Design an enzyme around this catalytic site. Structure first.
Site, mmCIF file in Angstrom:
data_model
loop_
_atom_site.group_PDB
_atom_site.id
_atom_site.type_symbol
_atom_site.label_atom_id
_atom_site.label_comp_id
_atom_site.label_asym_id
_atom_site.label_seq_id
_atom_site.Cartn_x
_atom_site.Cartn_y
_atom_site.Cartn_z
ATOM 1 N N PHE C 155 1.596 -74.296 55.311
ATOM 2 C CA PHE C 155 2.168 -75.090 53.996
ATOM 3 C C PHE C 155 2.306 -76.920 54.309
ATOM 4 O O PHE C 155 1.830 -77.556 53.067
ATOM 5 C CB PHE C 155 3.533 -74.910 53.696
ATOM 6 C CG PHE C 155 4.881 -75.391 54.250
ATOM 7 C CD1 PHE C 155 5.465 -76.738 54.149
ATOM 8 C CD2 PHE C 155 5.189 -74.489 55.435
ATOM 9 C CE1 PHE C 155 6.437 -77.037 54.588
ATOM 10 C CE2 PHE C 155 6.293 -75.044 56.359
ATOM 11 C CZ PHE C 155 6.798 -76.141 55.911
ATOM 12 N N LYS C 179 -7.738 -68.640 52.708
ATOM 13 C CA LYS C 179 -6.573 -68.084 52.494
ATOM 14 C C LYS C 179 -5.452 -69.156 52.586
ATOM 15 O O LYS C 179 -4.703 -69.227 53.667
ATOM 16 C CB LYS C 179 -6.196 -66.847 53.423
ATOM 17 C CG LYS C 179 -5.434 -65.775 52.451
ATOM 18 C CD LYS C 179 -4.187 -66.087 52.035
ATOM 19 C CE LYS C 179 -3.074 -66.427 53.133
ATOM 20 N NZ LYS C 179 -1.736 -66.780 52.582
ATOM 21 N N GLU C 182 0.740 -69.922 50.233
ATOM 22 C CA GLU C 182 1.360 -69.495 48.884
ATOM 23 C C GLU C 182 2.351 -70.617 48.404
ATOM 24 O O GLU C 182 2.698 -70.549 47.085
ATOM 25 C CB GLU C 182 1.760 -68.240 48.934
ATOM 26 C CG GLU C 182 3.250 -67.942 49.525
ATOM 27 C CD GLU C 182 2.782 -67.303 51.096
ATOM 28 O OE1 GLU C 182 1.953 -67.889 51.606
ATOM 29 O OE2 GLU C 182 3.360 -66.245 51.263
ATOM 30 N N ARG C 183 2.778 -71.416 49.295
ATOM 31 C CA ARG C 183 3.844 -72.408 48.595
ATOM 32 C C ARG C 183 3.303 -73.481 47.978
ATOM 33 O O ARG C 183 4.044 -74.201 47.022
ATOM 34 C CB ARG C 183 4.806 -72.923 49.962
ATOM 35 C CG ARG C 183 5.313 -71.798 50.696
ATOM 36 C CD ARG C 183 6.300 -72.238 51.927
ATOM 37 N NE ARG C 183 6.625 -71.147 52.774
ATOM 38 C CZ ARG C 183 7.475 -69.994 52.215
ATOM 39 N NH1 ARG C 183 8.106 -70.047 51.185
ATOM 40 N NH2 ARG C 183 7.875 -69.274 53.321
ATOM 41 N N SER C 232 2.719 -70.833 62.934
ATOM 42 C CA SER C 232 3.792 -70.602 63.978
ATOM 43 C C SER C 232 3.009 -69.639 64.975
ATOM 44 O O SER C 232 2.276 -69.009 64.946
ATOM 45 C CB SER C 232 4.975 -69.990 63.318
ATOM 46 O OG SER C 232 4.851 -68.941 62.862
ATOM 47 N N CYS C 287 3.637 -80.822 63.252
ATOM 48 C CA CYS C 287 3.399 -80.249 64.677
ATOM 49 C C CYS C 287 3.460 -81.575 65.507
ATOM 50 O O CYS C 287 3.603 -81.058 66.922
ATOM 51 C CB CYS C 287 2.131 -79.288 64.759
ATOM 52 S SG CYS C 287 0.637 -80.511 64.569
ATOM 53 N N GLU C 388 12.067 -74.307 68.297
ATOM 54 C CA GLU C 388 11.719 -75.285 67.264
ATOM 55 C C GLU C 388 12.224 -75.317 66.080
ATOM 56 O O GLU C 388 12.256 -74.325 65.343
ATOM 57 C CB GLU C 388 9.804 -75.008 66.927
ATOM 58 C CG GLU C 388 9.308 -75.819 66.154
ATOM 59 C CD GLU C 388 7.876 -75.911 65.862
ATOM 60 O OE1 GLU C 388 7.467 -74.486 66.097
ATOM 61 O OE2 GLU C 388 6.954 -76.649 65.425
#
Ligand code: NAD
Lengths: 497, 497, 497, 497
Positions: C155, C179, C182-183, C232, C287, C388
């Site tokens: 996202f 793909k 979806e956010r 992640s 990141c 994290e």
């Protein structure tokens, strides 16, 4: 797109703006299809050359300090602008050079290809880094720009040959001074204007018009680092000698005499089409034009009668007419020299299958027009075989086998391009690895290498040791620096260090 | 290992065998530690040069047709043989050149490094292949050998400089004719013998002894393709001009005047050690020797008193004595010229901190010996700063800051090597990317690049546009060929095809 | 540029056109600055994934047969279009993701950089050609496309991470199914539309929206060749295992915990500025964000008081306001998890210097807003050090010297990025060559490599053995083929042959 | 050279010395030409594997800190030693494996080629350096060793396959633990001894003998970074899955089913010779062996009768006899499985042209000998076409044209190697660029790529995304690190700085 017309004087380019000549000497510029002069071009003196060199030297440091990605973005904007205005440039080239409109469009496209390659210069400027060559020592290399470079270009490609030189030189971080051919200079100024519209800083690209005097002034200037030259062999040798005498990097491209070999197992129709196109495109005014047809075995009787039939049916006229396939010669002196070569070929024993002399084009009776010429039974000792005609003249030489053709080609003084038509893999492999020519084609009549490979011939076709554009062109415009680094203990500064 | 002694005449090498001279002209070869001649070397005429060139040309095609891996295996056997007989070669070099035995061992090791790099030539000869440049057309490039190449080498490295040239040239598929320095030629013959013991075919490597006459004969021969030269700047310029006039590829390396910069934050002891070593190793007879010490700020008073104390304590004597650190000068004329330079430096106002004239070595009273010389308060307008002394003379120049040192270095006519001692990262980065020198060292007094990078200076230190060994050396000895290939339909041969 | 508003459902992309969802399952999409849902996104089933894969497989052969230069020209037109509409895309990203408008502009620029690199693919697809490996045999290699490849993106970079994948994959000749997260899916559809406007053939680029079900459908499909994943660490490990189980090439990027080391000789003000920016840009949702500050020696008392003073003065609000420096969190669950991490850090003994909980923004009281949080005296055994947080939380760890900091960093489970601030060359060299991290910065807080190098971490930050974009990205999307060729004698066909 | 005989137990290698087994479990080692066991090999437990891994991990840091040139010199000494003792190793391989003596000599030579390539590792470890990516920032990449790597090798190449792995891994700076095939382990120990004689430090190269238990212990160990595997397809898939599950880099090579295509215009005699050699060399126990002959058009009647005549005249016997062309099978179980495949092929409808069952060799009646087998009219649905026999069985499949052969080959599950015999350039070009096989030969029956290219198949023949040796092998054993560097102003330290 309308035909290009203009009557203003053609000047120089300095500091991102056109400037009128100040020497007082001019030369007429002809429209070859009409046979009369239409404008003038100024011939720069020593002072104007010095002014251009000083402007380039002043602009060099800031342009060299610019990161390569920003220079690439400037070239990207220039590429967009070139794609926008390609038809206008093609019309200018047709008006001054005299080639067909579609041929000029192809020339512009081929220059745009080199610009596309040059847009990716950050990848090309990668150096080598080696870690721990000994205990605690690292070693890396990089390549840095030279400074002010000069380019000298011929008449037959007023757009593509300058694009062989200035895009890569600007991408690597140099400043450029261009000396175009005085027979068709306008295109250069057009390009300069586009370069200014793309955001190029003033003084990075300059144009000076002139002749041998301006060339000598450029070659003698102590602030010029490198010289690129395209032209005939004697002028290339003279330029290389004079530039080396003053301690400069030089690359100079010379003339050509390109052969096409037809094997007994080749496709006859495709071979005839290739011969016609590569021999009579742009009226034979190309360095990669085929001028000698080598016929092996019994295929000669299947080639000469067909080719002649195509040579008589060529459509010749003004370059802006869509149906015209061949245009006129650039000047009347060149036409006279071509006719003299044809007369010499007749006198020395070659058979004149097709004669192109005495051509009159309706509506263009004053143009420098000539027809296609075909010879047969040409011998190696004839002057039409040894010397470069640079016109629409094709000669046929008959040999017995493959080895005789290879020996004939390897004995010539030129090594620019060669082609071979066959369907046999072993013959193609042996021909490719045995021929003493820089550029080789297998069933390809005009084997011009891609933008990422480079352009260059062998023997008397090239003076120097580097090719044009590609990685060779990148290496020609840069100098290599090596750095070896080590450090001592830092305990003196503190216990933390 | 015993000292090298021999009284036979030194001849040429042809067809894999030594041959005695036939011209009738000889030159004496001196032992510098004794001050007297010990043997003679023949000076080849035009006929012997032509014979060597003809032998190389006869041997070229078969060697070029050999696959690169077999040539690499021949070089591998040669490397084994060189490692076997390194002490004998070092003893020969010490006997004729006059350097210390350990220095000769280091020179042999540095040549062996280049041979090790050249053993991996199949990887280096990779071309570029591109598929489907257009629909049905492929394009690939390769590099092929030139033919017969010639190398001309100086006296100070009778082994390493020839190893800069002939291993790569043989690996790429050329034949070699070597013209060594007449002051110490024996090593060359030794190397040739080893090359014959490794299985090299006869005629691939030839040696001719001589002087300017033999060099002119080599430069005028039409069967020679490339020339590599190492020596002084005027001779390099002359060689480049004469070889270009006959249409040959040329690379020529010139002289040097190397500076070492000491920053206020440098390590004082390491800087003093580096200055002593790089200024008085091999009696200053190196192209990468440090001849000018640039002192920035207040470190001068911490450098000059220490260096002088080390300069008076140098051990000078015969090169075969283990405790000796510096040997004699190569000839008496060179010693006289060095003394004249010292006298000129005294006359023009430089302070003579340490004087090395009037040295007598016990047991070697007739040798060409001299001591270390140290000057102070040297100015840019002095002749000892502008001209190359090529001896054990070190001058000190004081500047105020980093920018003054950079401006001083960039104004010199030589661009071979430079060094800077500091502990600051930003200063090192700016110095590395701003200095106009080919080879740069950070805390490295003698920054000679590794075998896979290449050797080359800038400005008047190099005539040409390619460096020695590495990928630059590989590209200098080969010419690029491009091949474009396509095929037509095969349905004519049958339905199966 | 106005703020982005839209209420239509977000569908998929197929055959060069948007298509509405057919499964019947939807998920709400929130505006983080308002705290309420504004639209819906469809969640594709197995049938829609199969339809997209079938379309890509149908389109693959013609796109693979296209010459690379024409594909590069398509990408060039796409680059022009992306430069034209950058503000609209940035506004969409700000509306859905919630970052600052200038940050979204920077993200779009960073994606455009990768597109610029991918435009030069003909140079990157050069193979190796070797002539005469044995007598009469040649050997060359090339790289060819795999087929249908799939990409899965997170996202936080709805534009840049997809540009890490699809430009290079399309340039090398593959078809792509994306793909997105979806956010914030809208940006993907925008990009697809631009790709259609640039002349890309239908079916080459497809988009499917969804969740774990769609990912499993993609991973199980036998017509998919390669998978690229960014997210992640646990999901990356799961994706790699499931894709390897079905025999696919996989690359998956995981999480991070980036340290910044401050040496006693660093510039204090620049270090404070770098810490503030790299810790609180984009609310720590990067990141490459710095989450641990390693303080060496006595500089801690000069860093913590200053940083805290900058942490309390941050301007927080809606992303479209020009003066705002930090926006809201993406969802309320993420905000709750960040607050739970802060509570855990307080409970385990860390000193809470600055507390960002309980923040209310005037006019945006329902937004998912939080303030900057600063901890001190963090220990390696705390959960806020090992795990994290992915939020605006910064912890400070104090060590005694350089070696302790290196040992602390090398013991962590993550190896993504690291930075060190110093003015000493030796410390920088040792830190660069000793640290066990993929990406290293010297005085560079966020060391993201250039487009021609590649992106990749070490240890648990990457699952696979190839990096993203650059030459690594080119090699990941292609497979190598070797060809060895020879021919026999052709004398059978005739005496001429 | 005498035949190899020995009765001592075969142990492991640790810390530069042989060590006897301690688990208590042994496996017999057979002489295939005699049909009886001659010695034993120990099967290591978990503790011995852990000991070897611990030794390698202890030795790793010092070996990694060694400059690459010194590692290359160690490999150079190892190459000299390998050339010295090639006949002894070949005799050992013949004694245990059972192949012909000349075949073993060829295998040793092919391994020596890879060692020769690995000797040039300093050139191969060049990184990329880019200057001024932005104003004042530089960026460079390098590749560093992984740590401890493991290799698992099959029985058919006890020397060459380990040389595919350990030379490059040691050159790049890793430590190696080898798990050889238990059917012929002695060669591995021999190699280890040679590595110790060349100056390799203790613990850098270790050997453990065993079976599936030792392989599982290696795959589960957390201190192992990379795994290389060569063997059959099911075991390769199992190894890849188990090694990925623990987070390791994996490359695994699988089985093959290689086709040779004969075109109507091919040379019949050369095609027959190639088929005989590539089908019956080493009794068909090669991954690159030809097992299917594809006959196009009417050439079948010119191929099958000739090949059969050569198949009946093969000389079969003990491998140390000079006149023998084919040796025995490795074990009796493999011979039984091959005979079962022949019976299945007869049962399913294939025509048994030549039957090799029921062979008795005079003087070697107990050996695992069998004759050459030739089938005709093989169909794609037969089990002898789909499954790998790994024996001296050749089947012939007849197709109508070129496209049918291409479609047949592209539908198979294996993609290792393919060959095509023709004299037409266009057919060769289309076959090379259309076939879905990793390794392609044009008139080359066994197209094994050179040492500088790499070995690798497609589809089910390879699990992973990198090839063996070459630049692919170099990249598999190293991880890439990127460094971005900048500095601030140094005026704070002083006016001089
Ligand atoms: N740049 C480098 O890599 C490098 C390396 C070593 C030495 N050098 C230079 O070499 C010089 C010392 O060597 P040297 O004294 O032997 O140099 P030099 O100029 O005498 O060159 C030696 C070679 O040139 C030939 N030669 C000499 N005079 C000639 C002439 N007039 N015409 C034609 N050929 C002639 C000699 O026979 C010999 O083969 C120094 O100037 C040093 O800087 C440069």
């Amino acid at each position: 797109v309308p035909a290009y017309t203009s009557d203003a004087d053609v000047g120089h380019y300095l500091d991102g703006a056109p400037v009128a000549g100040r020497s007082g000497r001019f030369q007429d510029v002809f429209n070859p299809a009409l046979g009369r002069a239409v404008r003038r071009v100024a011939l720069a003196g020593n002072d104007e050359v010095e002014r251009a060199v000083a402007s380039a030297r002043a602009a060099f440091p800031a342009w060299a300090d610019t990161p390569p990605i920003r220079r690439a973005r400037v070239l990207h904007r220039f590429l967009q602008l070139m794609n926008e205005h390609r038809d206008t440039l093609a019309a200018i080239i047709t008006a001054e050079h005299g080639k067909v409109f579609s041929d000029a469009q192809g020339e512009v496209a081929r220059g745009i290809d080199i610009i596309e390659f040059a847009c990716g210069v950050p990848q090309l400027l990668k150096g080598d880094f080696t870690d721990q060559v000994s205990t605690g020592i690292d070693n890396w290399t990089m390549r840095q720009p030279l400074g002010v470079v000069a380019g000298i270009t011929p008449f037959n490609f007023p757009c593509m040959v300058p694009c062989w030189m200035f895009p890569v030189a600007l991408a690597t971080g140099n400043t450029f001074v261009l000396k175009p051919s005085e027979r068709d200079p306008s295109a250069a100024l057009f390009i300069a204007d586009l370069l200014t519209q793309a955001g190029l800083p003033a003084g990075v690209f300059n144009v000076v018009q002139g002749d041998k005097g301006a060339v000598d002034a450029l070659l003698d200037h102590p602030d010029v680092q490198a010289v690129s030259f395209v032209g005939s062999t004697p002028i290339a040798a003279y330029v290389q000698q004079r530039a080396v005498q003053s301690g400069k990097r030089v690359q100079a491209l010379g003339g050509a005499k390109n052969h096409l070999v037809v094997m007994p197992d080749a496709n006859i129709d495709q071979a005839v089409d290739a011969l016609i196109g590569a021999a009579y495109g742009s009226a034979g005014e190309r360095c990669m034009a085929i001028s000698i047809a080598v016929l092996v075995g019994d295929v000669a009787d299947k080639i000469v009668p067909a080719v002649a039939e195509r040579a008589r049916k060529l459509v010749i006229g003004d370059g802006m007419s869509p149906e015209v396939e061949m245009g006129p010669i650039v000047t009347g002196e060149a036409l006279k020299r071509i006719e003299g070569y044809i007369e010499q070929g007749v006198n020395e024993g070659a058979q004149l299958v097709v004669d192109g002399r005495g051509l009159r084009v309706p509506g263009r009776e004053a143009g420098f027009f000539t027809g296609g010429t075909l010879f047969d039974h040409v011998k190696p000792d004839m002057r039409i075989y040894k010397e470069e005609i640079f016109g629409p003249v094709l000669g046929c030489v008959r040999v017995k086998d493959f080895g005789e053709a290879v020996d004939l080609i390897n004995a010539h003084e030129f090594g620019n391009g060669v082609s071979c038509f066959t369907s046999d893999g072993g013959i193609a492999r042996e021909f490719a690895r045995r021929i003493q020519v820089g550029m080789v084609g297998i069933n390809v009549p005009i084997p011009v290498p891609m933008a990422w490979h480079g352009f260059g011939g062998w023997k008397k076709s090239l003076f120097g040791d580097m090719h044009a554009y590609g990685e060779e062109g990148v290496r020609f415009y840069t100098r290599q620096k090596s750095v070896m680094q080590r450090w001592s203990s830092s305990i003196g500064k503190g216990a933390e260090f």
